[PDB]
Structure formats: C-alpha cells, structure tokens
Design a binder for this molecule. Structure first.
Ligand SMILES: OCCc1ccccc1
Ligand SMILES: OCCc1ccccc1
Ligand code: NA
Ligand code: NA
Ligand SMILES: [Zn+2]
Ligand SMILES: [Zn+2]
Ligand SMILES: [Zn+2]
Ligand SMILES: [Zn+2]
Lengths: 331, 331
C-alpha cells in the first residue's frame, strides 16, 4: 500500500501521473561532491533541477522515478532537497549501472544482494531514504559481472517486492538476455521494466517481451540528434530517429494489445557528467521542455493519433502505480 | 615552508619520521559511505585505523602520506577523524588512480588540471582539507587517459609545488614512460616519486631513474605471499619475493650513491574493498605489524646490514621532508 520516496512513504493514489525513468543528475559515485563546479555549483544544479521539476509539475507530473544508481552518482540528499523545494515526489533507486568501480565489480552475487537490500530496506548511505526500485544495465551481451548484478537484482526484488528496471542496447535485443537471467532466478516478468525500448524499431522484439509479461520502457522519446548530424558525440548518444517515430512505438504497442505494459518517460536530467562536456547544453537545446516533454508533447500527439483519453491516463497513472507498488510473489 | 595535512598546515620540521605511501582505506569513490558494513561499520574501521596509527606512532612514525585518490575512495573526513584521535599527521592526495569512473575518464587534460588544482589549493570536497601530494598510476604502458592524467598531474605540480607520486607495474618498467611524460611537461624529476619500485629486482632500471633525479618509492617492503602459494589472489597481489629481498633494494640504492633519492613505506591499509573479499585479513596475517613494519623491522634490518644511523634518519626524515615541501621550479 506504500511506495518509498525521498520524503518517505506515499500511498499508491498519491503517485498520480508518474515519469518512470528520469534523473536529477547523470554522474559518477562521489563526483558531484568532489567537483560540484563541473556543474557550475551544487546550488546552481539544485536550482536548475527545482525549476525543471516545478515546470514538469505545472504540466501535471506528480512523481518521477530517479533511476540513478550508486554508479550514476545518485546523491539522495540532493534528490530530497529538490523534491521538497519543487513539491514533486521522487522515487530513489538502488542497483548498478554500467560503470561500477572495482569495489563493486569484484563482489559476488551474495554480497551485491546484501547491498541492494541495504538500500531498499534500511536506507541509502546514512539517510534512512529507502530505494523504491532496482536499476540494472547491459549494453549488448551481459558481462560476467552484469549477470551477477541481474541475479542480485532479482533476489532483492523477490525479497522486497520492489520492481526492477533496466538500461538496454535495444538494438541488440538486450531485453531477451535480461529476461532469461531474471526468470532463471524466478522473478516475475511483471516486476520488470525493459528500458530504452524505444531505441529500436523492432516491433517483433518489443511485442514478444510484452507477450511474456514484461513492462516495456519507452523512455527515450525526446532523444534525437536530428539537426545535429554534424555533432558526432550527440548523434552517437541520441540517435537520428525523430521523437514522433519513437512516440509511435507507444501507439503500436497499444494497437498490439499491450497498453497495460507500457511505461513512458524522457530519461532527462539537469546535470550530466558521465559523457562529453557540454552534452547537457546540447540536450537542453534539443528538448527545452525537458521532463515536461511527455505531458506537453507526447500525450497530445498520441491523442491526435487516436489514442483515447482513458488509455493515456492508464499508461501515465495506472501502469506506474501497479509497477511501483511493492509486490511479493505469491507463495 | 609548510606541508598541508588533514588537520591543517604543519612546518617542515613537524613532519618527522614519515611513511610516504600508505592508505587508511583502499576502496572506491562513494563506497565507504554507501556500504560501510563492508568494513563491519564505519566506526569499526575508524577504530581499527586508530589502533594501527597509535601503534605506528609508538614506533616513531610521526606522519603518513595517504596516497588514496578520489578513485581509491579517499574519505577525507575519515582521515581527519583518525588523524586527530591517533595524533599522527596525515597528508591527503589528489590525482587519479587506475579506476576512474566515466565522469573522470571523459575529461580533458585542462579539466583534470582544474580538478587537481581544486583539491590542492582550495580543498577536497567541502572540507577545506587541501591535498599535499598528487597520485597517479599506470599498470604497464599508459592508456590514453592515463597519459592525460600524468600531464595534468605535472601541470598541477608545476603550479603548486606539490610533488607527484606514482603507482607502477615495476617489472614492466612503467617508471620510464612516466618520466618521459612528466618531462615532456617540464616537471623536475625531483618532484616525482616512482612507486612500488621494490616490486622489481631490476636494479639497472631503478638506478637509471635515480640517476635522472627521480625519487624511488620502495613502498612494498612487507608485501609477500611466501607461505600462501596456495592462495592465488594473494599470490598475484603480493608476489613471492621476501621482505628481506625487497629491503635489500634500499641498501642496494644506498650503495650506488642514491640514499637521497629513496622513499620507504609499507603501502598498508586498514580496510580494502577494491580486491577480493578477505584480502585485508590475509594481509594482516602476513604482516601483523602493519604500518609499524618499517620502523620495527626494516630499519633495524638495514642497520644490521651496515647502514649507518645518519643514513637511516636521512631516508626516513630528511628525504620525505624535501619531497613534501612545496617547491616551485626556479624562474
Ligand atoms: O483498465 C483499462 C484502463 C487502462 C488502460 C491503459 C493502461 C492501464 C489501464
Ligand atoms: O647530509 C647527508 C644526510 C642524509 C642521508 C641520507 C638521506 C638524506 C640525507
Ligand atoms: Na523498503
Ligand atoms: Na595547497
Ligand atoms: Zn540508461
Ligand atoms: Zn537513465
Ligand atoms: Zn598502488
Ligand atoms: Zn597504495
């Protein structure tokens, strides 16, 4: 009956319109604290985040799920501060992305399980802020270490009921290998969201996963380097497909009958240090709406394409609530 | 005229007997704060460190140089706490070791330079604790990023006068490439310590570097897996050469006329998460004296081999003082 947020537990109904894959800041463990000037200042980053969150809130966003793990440099204190200042619920994550340091990479599945459990059950660092989701990632075939992470994520999810969400190389069909590893641990597909799914046009891939019970994360909607074909780093990160092309995947899935398994987001951020310098500016020019892109542009676009009101509401409110609600496997 | 420590500046005379390459804890950025239970607890680690530092102090150690960088998970607050409780001076480091995260790895030489300068001139994180040394590393031929780190280290050293110390794959003669890069930036060899040098039996390589003015860090004295051949991980880390064989390299360099260019240490730690679990216990069994190994066993051993009192004092007090004193290149 409750979802853990950076301000404490909230009831399922309080979540409302939720963005399921976002970040306050895309960084590295200890980075923000050791080099805040990279972002101007910690205060500047916080203010930027508050402005963005307030604008998203004005557009109707009630909660965002910040899928920044330890290795994405998640700073829960920052999350709590901006959450309170903007009055937007923020769900924190545990798990590991694809930049774990040696202290993490050398751990066994058992040790990692304990770490994820710590962040979900007791709290992140010494804050008492409990994670409400487990984030994992692969970028093509999983590495040996990544298989361990996925297994630990499954074990933590099974013990706590908190869902798992992933980063994939959709092109490579990462989702299939992820599902395999998760199922090998007995995890229900309904507890899993296969992320960055809109990064591919393979509808066969998406649909087959959906068919198995998985949640499909169409969270890169505004990501596009069109118009910037000349910026190599940006094209590499953002792609050359339009937001409309990506958004159309939502309707496709809906048309195929999987409206209850779709999760939509922007994968936006206010700070981004784990890539080339300046990518943040580039991205903000590409999508000035930031996190508000979904409600301001995507939802209306889908409606114009014939997606009905109730389906739109189901996807943005219902689906996130069911996913986030901690749910233990029936015995 | 002053060396920066975690408790503030000290005069050159206050340094006294100094261990130039040590660590309170060998970890990863953000690791200790995110998973302190890995070390039992933060308190347990601190207590262990205080006991060890107090015993080293009893044996005559007045200062240690904690060469843990951002990526070694340096927690300056921990260092300050233990320094105060044990009453041992601790010099903190900036620089980058061999496990930098993406936020660091994608940076330019200019950016890294500013980061190192920040840590030396203004302070680490928001503490005001300023670094008194710059740490860098290679493990064989430098990677492209490592070359940048080395160049940034040289620039930071040139601007501040603080020395540079390195981690090397000694048996691969990394010191030579390191020296070439440093020199290409115009840094004086006298501001540089080529570390883990006792890991090789190639005296030619060491004397040729000494001949050029570099300091030679014979900081792995107590490291040995003799008696643990059956332990692959420990063997790989510590080697099969005895402490006496490593200590004899100190005598060899003295005999070749380089007593003013030798720095001796143990490369010890109180916690170690960046390797296999349990390596700390293994290490503590190998060398129960820990940091006190140098004054309790090595010094006497050398004396017994004929090294005079004055030479021993010069290596343990004079050399470290000269190296740590911030020294700008003459105009
Ligand atoms: O019950 C059908 C309403 C609904 C539609 C889309 C997503 C979740 C719920
Ligand atoms: O003046 C000679 C004293 C000395 C001995 C060894 C190292 C540094 C100095
Ligand atoms: Na919980
Ligand atoms: Na300084
Ligand atoms: Zn991602
Ligand atoms: Zn993301
Ligand atoms: Zn080292
Ligand atoms: Zn070391």
């Amino acid at each position: 009956d409750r979802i853990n947020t950076v301000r404490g537990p909230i009831t399922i109904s309080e979540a409302g319109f939720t963005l399921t894959h976002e970040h306050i800041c895309g960084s590295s463990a200890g980075f923000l604290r050791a080099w805040p000037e990279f972002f101007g200042s910690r205060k500047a980053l916080a203010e930027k985040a508050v402005r963005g969150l307030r604008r998203a809130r004005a557009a109707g966003v009630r909660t965002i799920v910040d899928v920044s793990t330890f290795d994405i440099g998640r700073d829960v204190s920052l999350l709590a501060e901006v959450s309170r200042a903007a009055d937007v619920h923020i769900v924190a994550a545990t798990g590991l992305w694809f930049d774990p340091p040696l202290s993490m990479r050398l751990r066994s599945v058992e040790e990692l399980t304990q770490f994820f459990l710590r962040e979900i059950q007791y709290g992140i660092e010494d804050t008492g802020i409990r994670a409400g989701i487990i984030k994992v990632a692969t970028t093509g075939k999983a590495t040996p270490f990544q298989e361990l992470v996925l297994k630990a994520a499954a074990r933590a999810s099974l013990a706590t009921g908190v869902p798992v969400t992933t980063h994939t190389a959709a092109s490579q069909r990462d989702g299939e290998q992820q599902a395999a590893i998760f199922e090998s641990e007995g995890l229900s597909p309904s507890r899993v969201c296969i992320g960055h799914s809109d990064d591919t046009d393979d509808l066969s891939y998406l649909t087959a996963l959906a068919a198995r019970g998985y949640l499909i994360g169409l969270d890169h909607i505004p990501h596009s380097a069109i118009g910037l074909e000349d910026n190599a780093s940006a094209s590499a990160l953002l792609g050359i497909r339009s937001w409309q092309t990506r958004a159309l995947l939502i309707k496709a899935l809906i048309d195929q009958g999987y409206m209850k398994q779709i999760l939509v987001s922007n994968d936006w951020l206010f700070g981004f240090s784990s890539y080339v310098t300046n990518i943040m500016d580039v991205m903000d020019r590409v999508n000035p709406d930031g996190m508000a892109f979904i409600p301001l542009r995507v939802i209306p676009f889908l409606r114009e394409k014939g997606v009905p009101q109730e389906t739109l509401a189901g996807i943005t409110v219902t689906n996130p609530a069911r996913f986030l609600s901690p749910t233990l496997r029936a015995s």
